[PDB]
Design a protein around this nucleic acid. Sequence first.
RNA 1: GGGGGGAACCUGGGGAACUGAAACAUCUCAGUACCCAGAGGAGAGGAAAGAGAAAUCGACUCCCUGAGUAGCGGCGAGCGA
RNA 2: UGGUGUUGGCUCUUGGUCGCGCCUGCGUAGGAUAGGUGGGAGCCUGUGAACCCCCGCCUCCGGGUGGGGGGGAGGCGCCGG
RNA 3: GGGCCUGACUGCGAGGCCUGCAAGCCGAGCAGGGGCGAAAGCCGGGCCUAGUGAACCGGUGGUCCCGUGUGGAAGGGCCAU
RNA 4: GCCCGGAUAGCUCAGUCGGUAGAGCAGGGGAUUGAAAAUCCCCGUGUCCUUGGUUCGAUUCCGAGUCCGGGCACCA
Lengths: 97, 53, 146, 225
Amino acid sequence: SKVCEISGKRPIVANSIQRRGKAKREGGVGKKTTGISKRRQYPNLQKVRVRVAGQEITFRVAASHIPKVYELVERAKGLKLEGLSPKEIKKELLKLL
Amino acid sequence: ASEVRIKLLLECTECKRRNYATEKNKRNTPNKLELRKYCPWCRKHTVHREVKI
Amino acid sequence: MKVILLEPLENLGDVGQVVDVKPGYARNYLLPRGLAVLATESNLKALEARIRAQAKRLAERKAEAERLKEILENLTLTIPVRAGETKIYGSVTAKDIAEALSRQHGVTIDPKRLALEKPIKELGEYVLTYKPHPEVPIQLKVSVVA
Amino acid sequence: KHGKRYRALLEKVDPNKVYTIDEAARLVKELATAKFDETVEVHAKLGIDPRRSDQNVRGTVSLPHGLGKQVRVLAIAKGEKIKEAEEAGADYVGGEEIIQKILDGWMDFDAVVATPDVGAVGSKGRILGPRGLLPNPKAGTVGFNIGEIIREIKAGRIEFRNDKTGAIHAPVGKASFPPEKLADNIRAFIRALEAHKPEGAKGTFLRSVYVTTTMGPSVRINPHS
RNA sequence: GGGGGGAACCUGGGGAACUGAAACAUCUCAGUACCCAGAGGAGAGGAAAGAGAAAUCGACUCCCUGAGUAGCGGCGAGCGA
RNA sequence: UGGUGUUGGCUCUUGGUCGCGCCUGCGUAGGAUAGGUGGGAGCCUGUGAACCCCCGCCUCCGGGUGGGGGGGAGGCGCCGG
RNA sequence: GGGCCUGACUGCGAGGCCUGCAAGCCGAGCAGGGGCGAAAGCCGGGCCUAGUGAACCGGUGGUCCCGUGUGGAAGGGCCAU
RNA sequence: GCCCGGAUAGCUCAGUCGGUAGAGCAGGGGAUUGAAAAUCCCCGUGUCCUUGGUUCGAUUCCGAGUCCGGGCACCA
Ligand SMILES: [Zn+2]
């Protein structure tokens, strides 16, 4: 999925590592790797609809930065943002970042 | 070399350092072997107990 | 997520109180419905010096609950619809009641505060709770006709 | 639901609040309302399994400050030991025919000790045993210095043993002891027990330490305090 | 103001296999080829939440040495500061 | 597919964790139902008696268990067994 | 067949056999400390030639050799296996 | 290797939270039946795997061991 609108958390290219065998730490002879495959770790993006400037706005933001959004919305109250449209509203809220 | 003739160790019950490894048919002698063996640590012969290998 | 109770709640407390509930309830129910506010330093600054304001508008909730309470307790609500001998061809919710007091009776109440758990589909008299203020049971009898 | 002389004892005690090694020793005497010198008791709950055949807590320590209890030692010994057995505390020696002197019913003794030669004591043991009287050198009560053994028997030597309920039990003295008389009594009770732990035990060796008296109420006290 | 082009050079996102292991999966090939994005005459880096042991130095970049060294490795091939 | 996030409120019920509160424990013998360990020669009731009645538990059916009433100081205790 | 005993040893090893290597093999003798026998002497498994498997990885017992600034510890080494 | 499961009548299995080793299957016999049968009545027989310890006694409770079964892995 695309970037996080706040954190910019992108999908990363991780290497799924199918390991095997008992661990040396548990006396095992060693963690024999059976195979290594590329994959992608996707951010936990969500859609977040918010009524700002009498306008409902949706952010594809990571799960972590959800409350950061509401931080932004509350901060927008010291802004004169109406009657802008949701495009300009979203741009300006991005500017508050 | 078998499950009935198992391996085993021989520890000096003075030094407590396993100084001898050997075998026995648990069938034949199902008791702990014990032998005056030379403990290298003790630097003197001593009853060495059959400690499980 | 500490939130500032802006009003009394059946399982949260009352205005001025600051509880910490899971984010779903406050941020999906409370924040939208303004029943609470997050616990920012900005809020905690104006927490006091607005507690007086919060309980001020609370008392406005009370006094309005009375002055309109007896305003709309002493009457009967009528509902002309299309319905059958044991059934309604249509259906009614709190919104139709708001049209009832708005156009028919002229008095202005709130649709949301009126509790309508199921949109009515039968005829006759029913009693409704309005409760504009917590612990303010404003009964109301409604009639549905054809 | 108790005796009004004891219900008063129930009233002047604080159940959940935890006292000190000295604080209940004040309460232990003021709770001494029985019509005789009650016995101070430290029923310190052990953290050990008796069902385990490894945690056999049974030892002894001679409490100073006396005990206030009456101890008559039925010592058993031979080979010149009857002399030193009769002396140094034991009143019933001896020293070989007291066995057949057991009826049983000749239970006019408060303690029994024996030198390791006897020997002929354990067999004759079966009724002398189950009432906690068989001579055993586990905790003090056996040895060829039997009279010397009995010398400290008079000197507040309380024995302690785990029970089936994981508890250990021994009085520090009668309910006539001052708190700093019991202060060395109590702390001697904790110190000896801690020295006799069956090593290898789930967590603490002691659950709690309560202090009651003969017909007296319990007391919540903090051990090692 | 941007667009798009620019021989190579450069970061950054992606990223092989052939190949070696005398097979081959880990591994190596190699983060290489190549793709995309970004510029630039360079780029990148860059001013210690460092290094590493001296209580020592004092951003960064590059050349030599360190050194095939320490190490990593089906402790193999090899890789390797 | 289970955990977790997104993801909340409301109840209802059940399995564990510790709170305590209580009751439970019966070979014979032994007065009787003896859970063990310690201390115990004493308890105790007008911070109302053994008695007798009523109320519930258990009951191994003899009783124990507790509560209410009259009664409301006579029963219990090592010792006897 | 009986008596006693555990040398079915420690540290080693002159020397040789065989042999591409590696492996395999035999061994006086030396010291330690013992068994046997009076002693001389023998005993470093079995009358012998088959009963077996390199290294790596890891286990377990000892050693205290290393222990990443120091002390420990992690962990490794070495011996045994 | 780690985990746990049981060792009981000829068998299966009960099994005390320590007072007793038991239910049925098998066996036999009696009645029973034309046979087969079933049924029925009654007897059958155990260190309660071994060692221990505790408590008056321990099948029980327990420490060990063995067998025993399974699973859970790891394999230089
Ligand atoms: Zn030794």
